[PDB]
Amino acid sequence: NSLALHKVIMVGSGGVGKSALTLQFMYDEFVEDYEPTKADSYRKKVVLDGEEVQIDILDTAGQEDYAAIRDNYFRSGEGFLCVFSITEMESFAATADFREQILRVKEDENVPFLLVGNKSDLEDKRQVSVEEAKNRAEQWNVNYVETSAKTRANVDKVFFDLMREIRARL
């Protein structure tokens, strides 16, 4: 009677595509204006490897600055999509901070976690090399996936593959 509930948290610096990825996954729409300061949760039934489950997505927005609240939000998460934009090197640099924030709270270096390089449809504006992102993912023992919220490339993959990590590790 009770479905598995996979609790996913989007993290990453501003403008990288957290909301656009979420809204593409949820509603099959590329949304380009979503309030940068708006954090919201989303829930959908999805059939994961043939099992009906519920995904809950917390689309964070960095507005909450009070560390105890931010940590409470992370503590509740079971898996993390750590998003940067391949067109903004500083957003890639910033991923280290989210990683540490998550590790401090979850206290488990194997927490379900994907490094997501979004905006793969903007190859001509790339600032982060595939090599260096892959190297960082290797250092963290996480998978690296490049996505485009615009074209839908690997959007279902990152949510499904994270749910597979949650299923396996919890």
Ligand X SMILES: *S(=O)(=O)c1ccc(S(=O)(=O)Nc2cc(F)cc(OC)c2)c2c1OCCO2
Q: How far is the CB of 11 from ligand X (least distance, A)?
A: 5
* Residue 28 contact, options ligand GDP, ligand X, Ca ion, none, Cβ 5-8 Å cut-off depending on partner type: Ca ion
The single-letter DSSP state of residue 32 is S
* Residue 5 contact, options Ca ion, ligand X, ligand GDP, none, Cβ 5-8 Å cut-off depending on partner type: Ca ion
Q: Per CB under 6 A, which of residues 111..150 are in contact with ligand X?
A: none
* Residue 73 contact, options ligand GDP, Ca ion, ligand X, none, Cβ 5-8 Å cut-off depending on partner type: ligand X
x/- map, 113-142, ligand GDP, by CB under 6 A: -----xx-xx--------------------
Contact between 74 and ligand X per CB under 6 A: yes
For residue 149, report the phi and psi dihedrals to the nearest 5 degrees: -60, -25
Q: Per CB under 6 A, which of residues 39..68 are in contact with ligand X?
A: 39, 60-64
Half-sphere exposure (Cβ direction) of 39: Cα atoms closer than 13 Å? 16
> In terms of CB distance, is 27 or 51 closer to ligand GDP?
27
* Residue 17 contact, options Ca ion, ligand GDP, ligand X, none, Cβ 5-8 Å cut-off depending on partner type: ligand GDP
Q: Strands of 40-48's sheet, edge to edge?
A: 40-48, 51-59, 4-11, 79-85, 113-118, 143-146
Q: Per CB under 6 A, which of residues 143..162 are in contact with ligand GDP?
A: 148-150
Q: How many whole angstroms separate alpha carbon 62 and alpha carbon 39?
A: 8
Residue-by-residue DSSP string for 60-125? --S----HHHHHHHHHH-SEEEEEEETT-HHHHHHHHHHHHHHHHHH--TTSSEEEEEE-TT-GGG
* Residue 119, Ramachandran bin (φ over 0: left; ψ between -120 and 50: alpha; else beta): left
User: In the complex, which residues of this chain contact ligand GDP (CB under 6 A)?
Assistant: 12, 14-20, 32, 34, 36, 118-119, 121-122, 148-150
Binding positions for ligand X, rule: CB under 6 A = 11, 39, 60-64, 70, 73-74
